Design an enzyme around this catalytic site. Structure first.
Site, PDB file in Angstrom:
ATOM      1  N   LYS A   1      -1.363   1.823   8.720  1.00  0.00           N
ATOM      2  CA  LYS A   1      -2.274   2.641   7.915  1.00  0.00           C
ATOM      3  C   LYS A   1      -2.367   4.043   8.522  1.00  0.00           C
ATOM      4  O   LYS A   1      -2.822   4.983   7.865  1.00  0.00           O
ATOM      5  CB  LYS A   1      -3.666   2.010   7.845  1.00  0.00           C
ATOM      6  CG  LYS A   1      -3.697   0.528   7.475  1.00  0.00           C
ATOM      7  CD  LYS A   1      -3.986   0.316   6.002  1.00  0.00           C
ATOM      8  CE  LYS A   1      -4.720  -0.987   5.768  1.00  0.00           C
ATOM      9  NZ  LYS A   1      -4.539  -1.447   4.360  1.00  0.00           N
TER      10      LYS A   1
ATOM     11  N   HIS B   1       2.231  -9.801  -1.370  1.00  0.00           N
ATOM     12  CA  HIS B   1       1.404  -8.651  -1.045  1.00  0.00           C
ATOM     13  C   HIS B   1       1.833  -7.817   0.155  1.00  0.00           C
ATOM     14  O   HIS B   1       1.126  -6.880   0.508  1.00  0.00           O
ATOM     15  CB  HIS B   1      -0.056  -9.083  -0.847  1.00  0.00           C
ATOM     16  CG  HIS B   1      -0.670  -9.734  -2.041  1.00  0.00           C
ATOM     17  ND1 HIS B   1      -1.386  -9.039  -2.993  1.00  0.00           N
ATOM     18  CD2 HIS B   1      -0.708 -11.037  -2.425  1.00  0.00           C
ATOM     19  CE1 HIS B   1      -1.844  -9.878  -3.901  1.00  0.00           C
ATOM     20  NE2 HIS B   1      -1.448 -11.094  -3.583  1.00  0.00           N
TER      21      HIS B   1
ATOM     22  N   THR C   1      -5.671  -0.338  -2.896  1.00  0.00           N
ATOM     23  CA  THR C   1      -6.586  -0.303  -4.032  1.00  0.00           C
ATOM     24  C   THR C   1      -7.729   0.663  -3.761  1.00  0.00           C
ATOM     25  O   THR C   1      -8.418   1.105  -4.680  1.00  0.00           O
ATOM     26  CB  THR C   1      -7.147  -1.686  -4.329  1.00  0.00           C
ATOM     27  OG1 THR C   1      -7.488  -2.327  -3.097  1.00  0.00           O
ATOM     28  CG2 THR C   1      -6.114  -2.521  -5.081  1.00  0.00           C
TER      29      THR C   1
HETATM   30  N1  LIG Z   1      -4.467  -7.798   3.642  1.00  0.00           N
HETATM   31  N2  LIG Z   1      -3.563  -7.406   2.645  1.00  0.00           N
HETATM   32  C1  LIG Z   1      -2.320  -7.873   2.452  1.00  0.00           C
HETATM   33  O1  LIG Z   1      -1.856  -8.750   3.176  1.00  0.00           O
HETATM   34  N3  LIG Z   1      -1.636  -7.320   1.449  1.00  0.00           N
HETATM   35  C2  LIG Z   1      -2.495  -6.349   0.826  1.00  0.00           C
HETATM   36  O2  LIG Z   1      -2.803  -6.763  -0.571  1.00  0.00           O
HETATM   37  C3  LIG Z   1      -3.482  -5.787  -1.379  1.00  0.00           C
HETATM   38  C4  LIG Z   1      -3.773  -6.400  -2.695  1.00  0.00           C
HETATM   39  O3  LIG Z   1      -2.535  -6.637  -3.367  1.00  0.00           O
HETATM   40  C5  LIG Z   1      -2.597  -4.522  -1.440  1.00  0.00           C
HETATM   41  O4  LIG Z   1      -3.210  -3.515  -2.185  1.00  0.00           O
HETATM   42  C6  LIG Z   1      -2.433  -3.954  -0.004  1.00  0.00           C
HETATM   43  O5  LIG Z   1      -1.591  -2.816  -0.024  1.00  0.00           O
HETATM   44  C7  LIG Z   1      -1.745  -4.993   0.913  1.00  0.00           C
HETATM   45  O6  LIG Z   1      -1.699  -4.508   2.234  1.00  0.00           O
HETATM   46  C8  LIG Z   1      -3.754  -6.485   1.699  1.00  0.00           C
HETATM   47  O7  LIG Z   1      -4.816  -5.830   1.547  1.00  0.00           O
HETATM   48  C1  LIG Z   2     -10.903  -1.791  -1.801  1.00  0.00           C
HETATM   49  C2  LIG Z   2     -11.248  -2.331  -0.375  1.00  0.00           C
HETATM   50  C3  LIG Z   2     -10.247  -2.514   0.595  1.00  0.00           C
HETATM   51  C4  LIG Z   2      -8.740  -2.129   0.338  1.00  0.00           C
HETATM   52  O1  LIG Z   2      -8.534  -0.809   0.859  1.00  0.00           O
HETATM   53  P1  LIG Z   2      -7.076  -0.199   1.034  1.00  0.00           P
HETATM   54  O2  LIG Z   2      -7.313   1.218   1.295  1.00  0.00           O
HETATM   55  O3  LIG Z   2      -6.195  -0.622  -0.119  1.00  0.00           O
HETATM   56  O4  LIG Z   2      -6.548  -0.906   2.437  1.00  0.00           O
HETATM   57  C5  LIG Z   2     -10.603  -2.908   1.875  1.00  0.00           C
HETATM   58  N1  LIG Z   2     -11.903  -3.087   2.229  1.00  0.00           N
HETATM   59  C6  LIG Z   2     -12.892  -2.925   1.304  1.00  0.00           C
HETATM   60  C7  LIG Z   2     -14.318  -3.226   1.756  1.00  0.00           C
HETATM   61  C8  LIG Z   2     -12.579  -2.547  -0.014  1.00  0.00           C
HETATM   62  O5  LIG Z   2     -13.599  -2.267  -0.923  1.00  0.00           O
END
Ligand SMILES: NN1C(=O)N[C@@]2(O[C@H](CO)[C@@H](O)[C@H](O)[C@H]2O)C1=O
Ligand SMILES: *Cc1c(COP(=O)(O)O)cnc(C)c1O
Ligand SMILES: O=c1[nH]cnc2c1ncn2[C@@H]1O[C@H](COP(=O)(O)O)[C@@H](O)[C@H]1O
Ligand SMILES: O=c1[nH]cnc2c1ncn2[C@@H]1O[C@H](COP(=O)(O)O)[C@@H](O)[C@H]1O
Ligand SMILES: NN1C(=O)N[C@@]2(O[C@H](CO)[C@@H](O)[C@H](O)[C@H]2O)C1=O
Ligand SMILES: *Cc1c(COP(=O)(O)O)cnc(C)c1O
EC number: 2.4.1.1
Lengths: 830, 830
Positions: free
Chosen positions: A562, A365, A664
């Site tokens: 980010k 990830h 996501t």
């Molecule tokens: N905390 N975190 C990670 O270490 N990797 C993460 O995984 C998610 C789910 O695959 C990805 O969408 C994020 O881009 C990635 O940063 C994420 O959210």
């Molecule tokens: C979907 C979700 C995330 C992931 O967000 P990204 O923009 O991919 O970092 C993080 N926190 C919450 C509460 C979410 O619903």
């Protein structure tokens, strides 16, 4: 009312009496002293009743038919509230709404009382939750396995503009969804030593901690399938944790039990960052050891624990079992599976290894180095001695494979080793996962390519067949039908309801892109959503916003990659331009930034302070008026996400190209009517590709440009020198314009931005504000903005986790998805 | 089947479907995987359903009518299992028996699965439980208030003849009887300091621990009254226990919450012994502070929280509230009630004191010095600073009262002080209770007199009106109907069922003392009871006994004052006489000794080893045969007591005259058909007085004789010199006859017996074995033994806790008992 199902005559009546049964018999209350919290619980218990019947037959079913089982191991499961989601998947929403209405209660008010199941940090944890929902919806015999932390991600509080962390006691009032199964408690070992005797090694003199399972139901969407999420809780044995005698104190011995039970007490609040603490490693082995015993037990019964060839032949193990490693957190499953097969079951090494590689698969990830798990050998040496021996033996054999394939390539050997030499020896968990899995995958097309080209290049050259890609996705149920019923209804009015479990059908909306009524409607629900959020804001947090402005929102964990800072730079720019030409018109904006910072991440916490500092200035400048508001969304979590995303106009996905694996949140905004401004990073690429780059606001460096700049060398001073607007902002920060009482408050940010910016914020500045001007221009044309919106929504189908899971199922697990309704829930009592 | 109620047609059917509802919906199981434990829970939940309706109307009732409320504060509540007891009090036993039978299950087998609620050490804790049952049966608006320990009295294990302690995780599988009430959580303060500002003192900078209440139903006997037992649980606040910032660690802060929650983790295993540990003092203030807030809140509502004179006049407090102090454990209630009234409510000292004295009453349970609570001032000073100030002020004013009453009596002043000077200053809790209560009582007539003549003589001379007596009692429900249905049935066959709640009616059995059928029956049930216990023994513990022998049993906590050692001396004597004249006939005996020793009580643990050591020798001597068996009853607890007592022939109550305050086990044996051999101690006197000394086996020194001996000086050597049989035993112990491998193993016992015997064991030896010969003689005459038994049973009525409570009610609390059936349980939903 909407297509939240039928509000049948017989069922609303049935619901009501069961609501009353529980309020009386379960809650032991009477209408005259019942509070909204009691009403919530009565309902929760009433709804939960409807899925136990299905839960029992689903599990019994898998026992009879005995299909290949999928085990999703993750240290994180970001579930959020579960009442509404359950009503939605059981087609109970309108009936419950009606019944509670008749009982004189507002269901929405009651839903707000349920605490979030915050057993996750962000994306990784939420992906797991979305996957579970999809796996249940696609009829897979899948099990989610994790840790039942009693304290999830901390609740964030902003005091004087600073983040304050406070324990998330989510179990304080109880959890009506879980079902403790003390009868399936298992023992897990720690420490000890290894004895090499005659016929095999023995893990001896270990400390025992017990793992008690708690099962939570995971209902599929309207198919009567209810899968299980099993969460382990740490419990101290009552013997040795008292019985290891000869003075210390009886009282003290009993109080010391909360030492073995601390293993499942709290979730580590790190997002994309690795902390090598012993407690974490214990949590990791704990979930793995307990889960594996559960897996093997189930396998021993199957149809082998009856007959089949007769002889516990683990040759069919991979045909009956598939375990998915969510990141490297549950990586010990590899050496643990070997330990059991070799040490306990007595299989030869090679047969055991073949089985292990064939049943395990690993998902990566992130590519940032600081997020990579590298455990010091002295830690594994003390805590899990036999596993260390197994890892060394795995390394030994793997490296021999490499030597044989690349004769004389001595550097490749050290590079690929699972063991890293240096200051302190470490074990590269990622290297372990690749070696012991038959599939390794990225979470977005570019991320997957980057793994092959960069980080895991050598491994790719060795075994190219292992590497795949599985673009992430989100569940249309929680992320559309649940949080945005208004949009779901108007879509359903034109194309039906089959799209909820077949999101590709959203493409049919393309033919309504010039439909006058539809454009008006899509635009209407978004306005209704913005009005509702603007209200919630004053309700629960207090101090007004304007619903007519453009809702510019960036909500995700606070990270340097980010680039919330880049968002900040733009906000300040807008402010400065307004102050320069006050009487010039500009499209009004409410920019909302929200997210949590890990407790020890100093920079991230400094950024939160900067955001609130900008709002203090901007929000109280009379010349600005209602044209610009800067708001920091407090305690961002799943339940809060279900509120902001449907109300957003602009989605900010501005990470430095090549750093966000997939993301996501971006997908959540696209399916909910927001336009995206972002970089060609993670899934953003596939999203722009699906909707057409003309319907996306792309800007900044591509991965190539970032690398070109690194060859060259990144010098931020250059940008500071050639852009006066940028210069003006940095000198504003440096002189205390945003921090009067403490003028040097933001020296760390400025210092970092100018001398150690790993994510080249300045490099994308010019192209970012230029691009921001373009979205403002388009927002001025409501009809065209909405039409571009319809182009995004109509084209977001590929981003449903149903698609993702179907791919994992077919290309990794070797199972076939099925949208077949399980044979009703109907009573039955054998 | 017996008078365990009616097995109605409609109700057995109703029971069965509810049993099934719960197995499915509550336990989430299906008949094919359900285990006896699941079946137990389904039943438990089914039975619990029947008393919620009554629980709710009872509580609502008290709210409407608003009678004087009784608050029983105790740090101990030895409840035991609650399934059967509930069935018995609800007349549900036969219906449940039938229904479970029809479902193909053995109810008795399921009852054995319920864990004991061991939140007590022995007599003191069990008295509280018996009182609760009686208070509910007599229709009193009473509340039991205590601590919900997660670990009760340790489970005892005998390893190599030694006691092994192991944590009693009674909540491991859950408690179906309790109802968490997180919504009534209250804050409790600790530490801090006192600020004296303008208008009053302020308790400041305190550490806060939260008290979460758990309510358990206490059903009266067949009267539809269900009272409440509220147990407090310690919980950490989520703010300061995280929010007191500036480095330490976020993870560590969360793990450290189990520091404030340790307050309710474990019960101190001390019986009649005082340990001045801080954790204990915290538990004591915790239960008091939480309870008092609950008491005042209820009072503020009453009918004053509507109108009445209008002005929170606490003058009526004593008319609405009565708090009973079970020993000095909850003694802080006195200064705490003052703190609230004076500091918070702002009443003048004198008005506050008048109220406090009028609402509090104290019960004393022992005269041994080592059991007396004397808290070091430095402890109270640090932990409860304001309370210390209040105690000093109470002392100041009280002593002035004394000085005025006994002018010039300077020694009396120091003797009566609440503050004890010396090594370290201490606070005499007992002195505090007497000063701040309007009634002080003993638990048996002689004990009460001893308090007046000795320990509290000065206080008696000062305020003679405060001192009373309330002879203890036991509940005929659990201690007769529940554990001995066979005896209850035959009694009911002759005199009816009204005696269950009117035990005095047992006197009518006197006229059947010459009835041939009755004698045969009384003798039959006892034989059936002995057969069932003899079976249980081999079932659960394994190694035979003879049901025809005399069942000689002594079961109570192990203490030097209880003299299990004197019982030992007799056992060894019997052995030695048999070995001397093998072919001479002697009445066979199975002597069963059981009880727990506090973990730190070395002597007590040494005695347990002696008992098992004697059994090792005696039980394997071929010449002895089946004439003599020595068995140590493991893990003696309430549930085990319900098994041995009904099977006992001889009850041993042989404490040194003047040391056992009352005792209650003795009463349990008397009502269950056992004959008593004992000393004129505690309630033994009133029992012999009630049955006639001719029907009792009394022996040994009276209190007078003990004192005569102390004037003289006790020299054990004298007895050793003049009794050869005694000499022979001591030299057997000294030479290793009972401990071959470790010949000096019992040197501490011998040394103690000869040089520091505080309970003059030797002094009562001769008269004890002589008396033992008399019971053997009478056992040889079955008809006369049984007739004497009928004389005891028929005369045990005075020892019902219903009598005790009625006396407390009338002579201390000022309320009138009532055997009026509350208006049915009938549905209702307002
Ligand atoms: N905390 N975190 C990670 O270490 N990797 C993460 O995984 C998610 C789910 O695959 C990805 O969408 C994020 O881009 C990635 O940063 C994420 O959210
Ligand atoms: C979907 C979700 C995330 C992931 O967000 P990204 O923009 O991919 O970092 C993080 N926190 C919450 C509460 C979410 O619903
Ligand atoms: O031995 C068995 N007999 C009958 N049913 C069984 C047996 N073992 C499992 N089951 C069924 O299969 C479900 C799956 O249980 P699991 O082992 O937790 O996966 C159980 O709840 C039962 O319905
Ligand atoms: O304000 C009130 N209105 C109506 N009933 C009340 C009120 N306060 C208490 N009660 C009733 O009294 C019972 C006693 O509650 P307690 O305060 O825990 O003793 C409650 O469960 C209710 O039935
Ligand atoms: N532990 N413990 C005491 O401290 N005092 C006791 O109280 C009970 C109940 O009043 C009395 O019957 C006992 O004789 C007395 O020892 C008791 O059992
Ligand atoms: C009744 C009881 C006691 C009290 O026994 P005494 O002989 O008065 O010391 C102690 N333990 C249990 C389990 C009891 O039932």
């Amino acid at each position: 009312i909407s297509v939240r199902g039928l509000a049948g005559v017989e069922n609303v009546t049935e619901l009501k009496k069961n609501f009353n049964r529980h309020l009386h018999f379960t809650l032991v209350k009477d209408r005259n002293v019942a509070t909204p919290r009691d009403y919530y619980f009565a309902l929760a218990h009433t709804v939960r009743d409807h899925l136990v019947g299905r839960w029992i037959r689903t599990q019994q079913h898998y026992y009879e038919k005995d299909p290949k089982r999928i085990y999703y191991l993750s240290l994180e499961f970001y579930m959020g509230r579960t009442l509404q989601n359950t009503m939605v998947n059981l087609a109970l929403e309108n009936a419950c709404d009606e019944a509670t209405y008749q009982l004189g209660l507002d269901m929405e008010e009651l839903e707000e009382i349920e605490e979030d199941a915050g057993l996750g940090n962000g994306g990784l944890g939420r992906l797991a939750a979305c996957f579970l929902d999809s796996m249940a919806t696609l009829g897979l015999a899948a099990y989610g396995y994790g840790i039942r932390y009693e304290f999830g991600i901390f609740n964030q509080k902003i005091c004087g503009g600073w983040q304050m962390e406070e324990a998330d006691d989510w179990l304080r009032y109880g959890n009506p969804w879980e079902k403790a199964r003390p009868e399936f408690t298992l023992p897990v070992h720690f420490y000890g030593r290894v004895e090499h005797t005659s016929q095999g090694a023995k893990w001896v003199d270990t400390q025992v901690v017990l793992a008690m399972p708690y099962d939570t139901p995971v209902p599929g969407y309207r198919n009567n399938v209810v899968n299980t999420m099993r969460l382990w809780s740490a419990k101290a044995p009552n013997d040795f944790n008292l019985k290891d005698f000869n003075v210390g104190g009886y009282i003290q011995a009993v109080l010391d039990r909360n030492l073995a039970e601390n293993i499942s007490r709290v979730l580590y609040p790190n997002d994309n960052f690795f902390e090598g603490k012993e407690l974490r490693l214990k949590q990791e082995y704990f979930v793995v050891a307990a889960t594996l015993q559960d897996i093997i037990r189930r396998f021993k019964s199957s149809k082998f624990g009856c007959r089949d060839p007769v002889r516990t032949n683990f040759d069919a193990f991979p045909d009956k079992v598939a375990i998915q490693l969510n990141d490297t957190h549950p990586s010990l499953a590899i050496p643990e599976l070997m330990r059991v097969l070799v040490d306990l079951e007595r299989l030869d090494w090679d047969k055991a290894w073949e089985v292990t590689v064939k049943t395990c698969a690993y998902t990566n990830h992130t590519v940032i180095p600081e997020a990579l798990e590298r455990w010091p050998v002295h830690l594994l040496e003390t805590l899990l001695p036999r596993h260390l021996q197994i890892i060394y033996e795995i390394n030994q054999r793997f490296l021999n494979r490499v030597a044989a394939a690349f004769p004389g390539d001595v550097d490749r050997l050290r590079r690929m080793s699972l063991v890293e030499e240096g200051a302190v020896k470490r074990i590269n968990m990622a290297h372990l996962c690749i070696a012991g899995s038959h599939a390794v995958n990225g979470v977005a097309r570019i991320h997957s390519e980057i793994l092959k080209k960069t980080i895991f290049k050598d491994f790719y050259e060795l075994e190219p067949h292992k590497f795949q890609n599985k673009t992430n996705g989100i569940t249309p149920r929680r992320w559309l039908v649940l949080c945005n019923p208004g949009l779901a209804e108007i879509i359903a009015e034109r194309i039906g309801e089959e799209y909820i479990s077949d999101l590709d059908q959203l493409r049919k909306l393309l033919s309504y892109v010039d439909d006058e009524a539809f454009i008006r409607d899509v635009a209407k629900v978004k306005q209704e959503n913005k009005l509702k959020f603007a209200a919630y804001l004053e309700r629960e947090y207090k101090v007004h916003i304007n619903p007519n402005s453009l809702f510019d929102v960036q909500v995700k964990r606070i990270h340097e990659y980010k680039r919330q800072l880049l968002n900040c730079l733009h906000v300040i720019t807008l402010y400065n331009r307004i102050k320069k030409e006050p009487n010039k018109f500009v499209v009004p904006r409410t920019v909302m930034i929200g997210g949590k910072a890990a407790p020890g991440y100093h920079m991230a916490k400094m950024i939160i302070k900067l955001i609130t500092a900008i709002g203090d200035v901007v929000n109280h400048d009379p010349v600005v008026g209602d044209r610009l508001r800067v708001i920091f969304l407090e305690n961002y979590r799943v339940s809060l996400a279900e509120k902001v995303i449907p109300a957003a106009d602009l989605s900010e996905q501005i990470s430095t190209a090549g750093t966000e694996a997939s993301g996501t949140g971006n997908m959540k905004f696209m399916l909910n009517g927001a336009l995206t401004i972002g970089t060609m990073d993670g899934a953003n690429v596939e999203m722009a590709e699906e909707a057409g780059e003309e319907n996306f606001f792309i800007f900044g460096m591509r991965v190539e440009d970032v690398d070109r700049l690194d060859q060259r060398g990144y010098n931020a001073q250059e940008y500071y020198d050639r852009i006066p607007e940028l210069r003006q902002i940095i000198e504003q920060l440096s002189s205390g314009f945003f921090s009067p009482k403490q003028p040097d408050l933001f020296k760390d940010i400025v210092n970092m931005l100018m001398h150690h910016d790993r994510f080249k914020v300045f490099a994308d500045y010019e192209e970012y504000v230029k691009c921001q001007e373009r979205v403002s221009a388009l927002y001025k044309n409501p009809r065209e903005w909405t039409r571009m919106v319809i182009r995004n929504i109509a084209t977001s189908g590929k981003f449903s986790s149903d698609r993702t899971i179907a791919q994992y199922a077919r290309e990794i697990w070797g199972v076939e998805p099925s949208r077949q309704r399980l044979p009703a829930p109907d009573e039955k009592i054998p």
